Paper text:
Aminoacyl-tRNA synthetases (AARSs) catalyze the attachment of respective amino acid substrate to its cognate tRNA through a two-step reaction. In human, there are cytosolic and mitochondrial aspartyl-tRNA synthetases (DRS and DRS2), which share only 22.9% sequence identity. In the case of DRS, it is one of the components that forms the multi-tRNA synthetase complex (MSC) in higher eukaryotes. In the MSC, DRS is known to interact with the AARS-interacting multifunctional protein 2 (aminoacyl-tRNA synthetase-interacting multifunctional protein AIMP2/p38)8,9 and the lysyl-tRNA synthetase (KRS).
In this study, we present the crystal structure of human cytosolic DRS at 2.25 Å. We show that DRS forms a homodimer with the N-terminal extension, anticodon-binding domain, hinge region, and catalytic domain. In addition, the N-terminal extension, which is a distinct domain in mammalian DRS, could be partially modeled including the C-terminal three residues of the characteristic helix motif [Fig. 1(A)]. The anticodon-binding domain of DRS (residues, 57–146) adopts the oligonucleotide binding-fold (OB-fold) that is composed of a five-stranded antiparallel β-sheet connected by helices and loops (β1–β5) to form a closed β-barrel. In the middle of the hinge region, residues 163–172 could not be modeled owing to the lack of the electron density and the disordered residues are considered as a part of binding region to the ribose-phosphate backbone in the D-stem of tRNAAsp, compared with the known S. cerevisiae DRS–tRNAAsp complex structure. In addition, residues 224–247 in the flipping loop and residues 273–282 in the Motif 2 could not be observed in our crystal structure [Fig. 1(B)]. Thus, we suggest that the phosphorylation of Ser146 could initiate a conformation change of the DRS dimer and trigger an unpredicted function of DRS by releasing it from the MSC.
Numbering used by the authors:
A (entry chain A): 21 to 162, 173 to 223, 248 to 272, 283 to 495
B (entry chain B): 21 to 162, 173 to 223, 249 to 272, 283 to 495
Amino acid sequence: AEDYAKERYGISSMIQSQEKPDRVLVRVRDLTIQKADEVVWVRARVHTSRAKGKQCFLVLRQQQFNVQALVAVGDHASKQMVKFAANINKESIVDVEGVVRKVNQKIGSCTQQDVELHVQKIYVISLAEPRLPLQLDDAVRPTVNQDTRLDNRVIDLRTSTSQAVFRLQSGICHLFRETLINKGFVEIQTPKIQSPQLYKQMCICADFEKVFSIGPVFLTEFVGLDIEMAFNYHYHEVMEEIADTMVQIFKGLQERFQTEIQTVNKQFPCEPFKFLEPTLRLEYCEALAMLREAGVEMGDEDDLSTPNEKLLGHLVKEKYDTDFYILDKYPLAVRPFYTMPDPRNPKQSNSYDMFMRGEEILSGAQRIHDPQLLTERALHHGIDLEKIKAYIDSFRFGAPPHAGGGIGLERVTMLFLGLHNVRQTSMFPRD
Amino acid sequence: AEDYAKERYGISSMIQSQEKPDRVLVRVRDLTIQKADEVVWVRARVHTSRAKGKQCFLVLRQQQFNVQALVAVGDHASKQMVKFAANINKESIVDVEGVVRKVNQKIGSCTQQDVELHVQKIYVISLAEPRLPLQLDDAVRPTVNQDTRLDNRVIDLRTSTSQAVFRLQSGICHLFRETLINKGFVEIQTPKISPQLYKQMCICADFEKVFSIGPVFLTEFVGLDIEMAFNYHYHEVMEEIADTMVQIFKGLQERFQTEIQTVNKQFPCEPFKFLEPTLRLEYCEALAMLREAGVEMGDEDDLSTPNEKLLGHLVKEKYDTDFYILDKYPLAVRPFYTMPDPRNPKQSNSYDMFMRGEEILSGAQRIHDPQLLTERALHHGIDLEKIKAYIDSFRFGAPPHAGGGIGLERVTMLFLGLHNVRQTSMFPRD
């Protein structure tokens, strides 16, 4: 009845844009010592809460960042307000007005360690229902299984790890596009109703020259970042561009996303990703030699098995101190019909895979731009020419020599951070 | 022994990466007066050619740009070489070596008008078959039907108009992402087995500012989508969306002028107009405007297409803009997730945006409250059972949020004043 702090708290009216307050909401991550003794408004989630005596301690979380808030009986809060605060369901969103105060000793369990928020006002703007299916702290500790997490995506995506993973994942897309655009590339929009490659090659035959696409690829669905490029005389022109683009991504991530890399590292310990400048390139023959030295028995025209890729990747990592490299000149026999044969060594092909942490992320080649040869290769592979006639015909009115290849975003995210399986890098996994 | 030019021209071996020549191939766009009297190597398409006497003129095309080249009996080329050049099938790709020469009359049929290429060497690196299904000059004149042009896509995409259209379209995507990212957005990848559900999940998962680009749906177009938590009023988002479009329009007009002109030539279009900041009109104001024009409309009626088109014309005449916002549509014509106006309950916190009198975006503040969402869903006669998981995502705290999306082809088409969306779709299927 009496309570003096009544106007300073509670659950507020649903936000329906009835007003535009004159008010600045500061980000948790900007609660530093620079703001000491300033009054601020903060919107955050109630991560957790504890109360004793005349005090309520809260952890206020904004994504990756979190801060301590204290509600204490005095000039601002009544004991009624303290109690209200202590009872706010976890994951509720609150608007808090408080003074930023320096603390004598660092608040070790928060990202904002040098200050705390002394609450003068606190309103629940969105009340969470009491039954949390998942606890955020559980979800991030190095227990919560694949199942509940995948069942409760909205909750799991809130964790500092999840935020880090997908913010970085968006960083990969951004970096890929920007690098490609600055190299003169044009983004294209492939339909899905005839796999991304057919269209990219069409665009090359249509004078596009440098193209990329980013989109669903398919009963599994994933996200492919695809490159196709006309070149002057040698496919190494394209191979090198692709490798350099990967390198710009790794550079950019380590320069701009260090905070998220360190966040994921806290849950899933991983050595920083290593790469050379320029990229290491090895020929198939050298790989065969290395594997044989390790006592692996392999034919000169065999494909690399997964276990052998992993070993070679370990060998390369030991020998060259790199997690990223290109393997070039695969046997023509293991590659797809549209693959250009090697002109010096006719057993081999103008084709390449690239690997991260000993796992294949890209499989490209110089394509065959000549109708006759393409047809000849297709015949050798037993392909019915009738069902690929439209594809072959697209090269008959002049086509430039070209090459390309693509990556899977989730895959590249998983390997860069050294995660357990792609599911850990798919926002909406199935299943 | 008659042909002195034998080594200078011919059909070259198939490019199979058998060599890395020390050779720089210069872009046709770079052939200018600045390069006069330089020897250069150029790779290009034989767009057209003509021959008489001791001379062969070719138009060498490298995408949007083209240059005139001259093979002529002299120190380098023989009669034989001239004859060979004269017989290269159109659309073949050639590697040409030649000197850049200042010409005194503008070569007004080319983009490179100040210079021509005096050929010293010419090789076909890719020989085109003889009978083209489609002539490129026909497909760009204010002639070729939509029909042969969809059958022979690879050829059609080659026209200076297709090049300009799709280069600019890629530029739209770029500017859309870039602006949003600078405003702090995160790109998300939504599955296709619509993005709205998923965008709202991310907002409920504390991502705050998400966008997605990808296929939308029995037709498929490309969607550029935004969703954004805000502080107190959905105008915070509406403004961010409108401003993103402003950044797109500006960047196109700054950086894609030659491609805008290329399309203008084939399909005349007044330059696209917009205000800074974006014009916003409320529903009531639009009704008043339409009534003055003699249209009869109920207060809670949805804007018909003919009525949008008229309204667009009216705002163009009065405010001099091709882009505007209409705010506060009636609640009854909007989707169940649309938040009602807290002040006028017949209206809603919803908006459409228009380019040249046609709708490109339809957004609202969404309902981030489980109870109200459910009510509203009931009102719309939706089975709560089949949207259960959607509602359930708002049960654990959600911020107030708004969003809206555009169609890429549609926005390209309306910016350029084009006739239909097929013109702006790279791979159409009827």
